[PDB]
Amino acid sequence: MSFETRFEKMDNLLRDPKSEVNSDCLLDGLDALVYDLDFPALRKNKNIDNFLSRYKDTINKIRDLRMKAEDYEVVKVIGRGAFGEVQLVRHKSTRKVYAMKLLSKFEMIKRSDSAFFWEERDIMAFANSPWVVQLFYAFQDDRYLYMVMEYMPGGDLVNLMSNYDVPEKWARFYTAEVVLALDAIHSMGFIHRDVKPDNMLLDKSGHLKLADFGTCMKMNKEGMPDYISPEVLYYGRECDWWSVGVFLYEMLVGDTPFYADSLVGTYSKIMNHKNSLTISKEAKNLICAFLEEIKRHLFFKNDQWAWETLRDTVAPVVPDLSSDIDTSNFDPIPKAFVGNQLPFVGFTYYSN
Amino acid sequence: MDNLLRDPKSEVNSDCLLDGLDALVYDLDFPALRKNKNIDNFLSRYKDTINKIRDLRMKAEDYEVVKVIGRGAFGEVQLVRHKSTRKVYAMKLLSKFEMIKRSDSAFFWEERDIMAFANSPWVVQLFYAFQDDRYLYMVMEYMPGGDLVNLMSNYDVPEKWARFYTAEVVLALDAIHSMGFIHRDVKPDNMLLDKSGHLKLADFGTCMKMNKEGMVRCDTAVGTPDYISPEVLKSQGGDGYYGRECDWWSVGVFLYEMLVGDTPFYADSLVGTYSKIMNHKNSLTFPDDNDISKEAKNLICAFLTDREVRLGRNGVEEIKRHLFFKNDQWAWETLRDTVAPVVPDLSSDIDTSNFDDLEEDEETFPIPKAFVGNQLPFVGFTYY
Numbered sequence A: 001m002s003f004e005t006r007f008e009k010m011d012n013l014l015r016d017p018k019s020e021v022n023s024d025c026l027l028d029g030l031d032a033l034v035y036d037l038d039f040p041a042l043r044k045n046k047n048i049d050n051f052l053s054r055y056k057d058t059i060n061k062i063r064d065l066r067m068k069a070e071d072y073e074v075v076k077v078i079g080r081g082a083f084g085e086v087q088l089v090r091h092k093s094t095r096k097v098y099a100m101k102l103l104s105k106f107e108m109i110k111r112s113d114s115a116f117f118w119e120e121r122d123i124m125a126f127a128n129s130p131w132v133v134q135l136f137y138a139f140q141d142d143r144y145l146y147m148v149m150e151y152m153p154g155g156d157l158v159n160l161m162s163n164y165d166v167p168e169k170w171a172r173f174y175t176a177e178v179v180l181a182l183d184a185i186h187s188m189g190f191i192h193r194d195v196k197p198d199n200m201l202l203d204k205s206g207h208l209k210l211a212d213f214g215t216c217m218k219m220n221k222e223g224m225p226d227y228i229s230p231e232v233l234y235y236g237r238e239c240d241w242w243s244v245g246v247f248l249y250e251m252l253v254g255d256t257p258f259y260a261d262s263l264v265g266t267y268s269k270i271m272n273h274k275n276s277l278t279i280s281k282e283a284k285n286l287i288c289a290f291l292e293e294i295k296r297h298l299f300f301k302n303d304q305w306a307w308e309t310l311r312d313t314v315a316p317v318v319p320d321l322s323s324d325i326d327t328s329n330f331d332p333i334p335k336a337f338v339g340n341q342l343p344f345v346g347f348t349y350y351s352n
Numbered sequence B: 001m002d003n004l005l006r007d008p009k010s011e012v013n014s015d016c017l018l019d020g021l022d023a024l025v026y027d028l029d030f031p032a033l034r035k036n037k038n039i040d041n042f043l044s045r046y047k048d049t050i051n052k053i054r055d056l057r058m059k060a061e062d063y064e065v066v067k068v069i070g071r072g073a074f075g076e077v078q079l080v081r082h083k084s085t086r087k088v089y090a091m092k093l094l095s096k097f098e099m100i101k102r103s104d105s106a107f108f109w110e111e112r113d114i115m116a117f118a119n120s121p122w123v124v125q126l127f128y129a130f131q132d133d134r135y136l137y138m139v140m141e142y143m144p145g146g147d148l149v150n151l152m153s154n155y156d157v158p159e160k161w162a163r164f165y166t167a168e169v170v171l172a173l174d175a176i177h178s179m180g181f182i183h184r185d186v187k188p189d190n191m192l193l194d195k196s197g198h199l200k201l202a203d204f205g206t207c208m209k210m211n212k213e214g215m216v217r218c219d220t221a222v223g224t225p226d227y228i229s230p231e232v233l234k235s236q237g238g239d240g241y242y243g244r245e246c247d248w249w250s251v252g253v254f255l256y257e258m259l260v261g262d263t264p265f266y267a268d269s270l271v272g273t274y275s276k277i278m279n280h281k282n283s284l285t286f287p288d289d290n291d292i293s294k295e296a297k298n299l300i301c302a303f304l305t306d307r308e309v310r311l312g313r314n315g316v317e318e319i320k321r322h323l324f325f326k327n328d329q330w331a332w333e334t335l336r337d338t339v340a341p342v343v344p345d346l347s348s349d350i351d352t353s354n355f356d357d358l359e360e361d362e363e364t365f366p367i368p369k370a371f372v373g374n375q376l377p378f379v380g381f382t383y384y
């Protein structure tokens, strides 16, 4: 550990996209500091005042040069969540079409929990898997966190099940794609915890890709509303497979296995699954098995596809697209330092 | 477009951005502040990673301190050797506590830039600038010949030597003026000598950038009581408008002291010196005996007058054209290439014979009960 060796080691940390002290993450620190200090009450402090005087125009210049919401033309809102929305966007300069997820910093600060997105960021950006929705850019302003992802024109599997009477042949395909998709997540050292058809999106070819990773959690050393498993409602990766069985049941029956008009009713039905759980014999066998060993099950035995070439085969529903923007498959001032921008330092990612 | 992240003169350069995070971790890591969930969780995420950064980056521990070779108001200068490269340097330390306590924690910026980007043989080179929660560190080139105060005390300086050192100061100050600065504290303590015995200016802590008409507006008197000019000495709110001629006054003070052995406005009482500078018309007297020539007396008097009639007012060429500098040994354009009057006898790369010994004695910031940001005036100081 003697420089220029430790100088090279320092230079690697500034260039690495996976690094928390990366050039883009360091700019976030100064950007957040300027946002959180620029108030008349705080400017009474000579240290705060003079720091802001020096990094005044230069941070405004940085804000102009860096990626912002103004660089994207919003076509239409294609999704909504608890803390934000997903909009179909087109980059004004490149004319490239994307899906932009927005997360309200106000809501993340108000009702606490402002760390859920860190899992979603690392998964979507560093997966490099055909089973995960790719994150091209991540940026932020004083109000929102923005996630520029690849657009999925095929829509979600909730929309597919509502528009089609799903046969067992189709059910075999989509379940198998989810199995391969979840295995990639586990291989990355993560557990989904919210496997559902709303989080299963289809591309232009009609193939599955997992989304909404705001419920994920990184595994330790060894690996430790109806879709929830009894263990969650210390555990391994086997908890996500329960939700696969829930998904397979709903796909073939048309209703969730533990449905109740009262949410508390579903909770009691999940805990009593042994007496609560009420097509073919092998499909029923798989649902009950969840309620390589998954891949070896008789339900997946077919003459159309193979596990290693499944994504290369023709999907059951290939979306009819007219354009690159086709959406037919979609329906206080502080009196002292508070540091509201601090939980969001290091969110900015660009790739290449 | 990322020119702002690569440029060493940029305030948003990679090293300056790290300072922001480093300062934030220092200023937020207190139990009272950690009660805030935003501050607590930010510090939890950038915990180990900032400690890793602190280990990888340049620190005081990378340098082996040989001995203290200088002392200032806000710090000290120590002869150091880099532990890894074994390279010998002079490290200036500036107390963040003293800068915050006494206010005025912005003097070092122009000093950092002048030493770093002058690229002149007349200016002491700054190789590295770094910091911790307590000090600002300035890794500079070591000047083994010492200061001109030490030279005048150890030698009975003749006029031939006086002609050389005055001429080197003239060329040195002209370079600082060409960079758009007024020194404001020209004295022999700030005049250092290299291994060859040639002059280099140091301590640019009083330096101020001139406007397009070479002027400066300052409401506070700056410099040393013996070397200060009348225009700078009497500066106050409303009346503090002066040019580069104030540096030339100090040259005349330096030339007088070199030949006489005493400052021209010396007094045992400091206010006596103040009075003597303001009354320079009747105060400037040469010792009765006389041996210091007619042209040397002419130069001292040409500098030691009111600004409007002071030599140098019409540029540096009128100073260079003075009869005192007329000699048969050197020329203005080749002066630094000629052999110096005193070439230091050096036994080792860590020879401190030309520096006197210094004695010993710190204070720290109280724990904050709310955010104070004591590290904020020092963000961006890190260089190379």
Ligand SMILES: COc1ccc(C(=O)NCc2cccc(C(=O)Nc3nc4c(s3)CN(C)CC4)c2)cc1OC
Binding pocket: A078, A079, A080, A081, A082, A083, A084, A085, A086, A099, A101, A102, A103, A113, A116, A133, A149, A150, A151, A152, A201, A211, A212, A213, A214, A215
């Ligand atoms: C490229 O295609 C897409 C990729 C992902 C998504 C997606 O993600 N949708 C759900 C969503 C959207 C917006 C906000 C939130 C949200 O607030 N999600 C939240 N999750 C948690 C919150 S708020 C608070 N906390 C209790 C922990 C978990 C969720 C949509 C897409 O388009 C179809």
Ligand SMILES: COc1ccc(C(=O)NCc2cccc(C(=O)Nc3nc4c(s3)CN(C)CC4)c2)cc1OC
Binding pocket: B069, B070, B071, B072, B073, B074, B075, B076, B077, B090, B092, B093, B094, B104, B107, B124, B140, B141, B142, B143, B192, B202, B203, B204, B205, B206
């Ligand atoms: C290459 O070798 C050397 C290079 C530079 C120096 C040097 O520079 N010495 C003066 C000095 C040293 C330490 C601190 C300060 C200081 O506190 N300087 C200060 N300047 C100002 C302050 S405190 C506050 N304010 C009154 C206005 C400007 C001054 C010495 C060297 O060799 C011995």
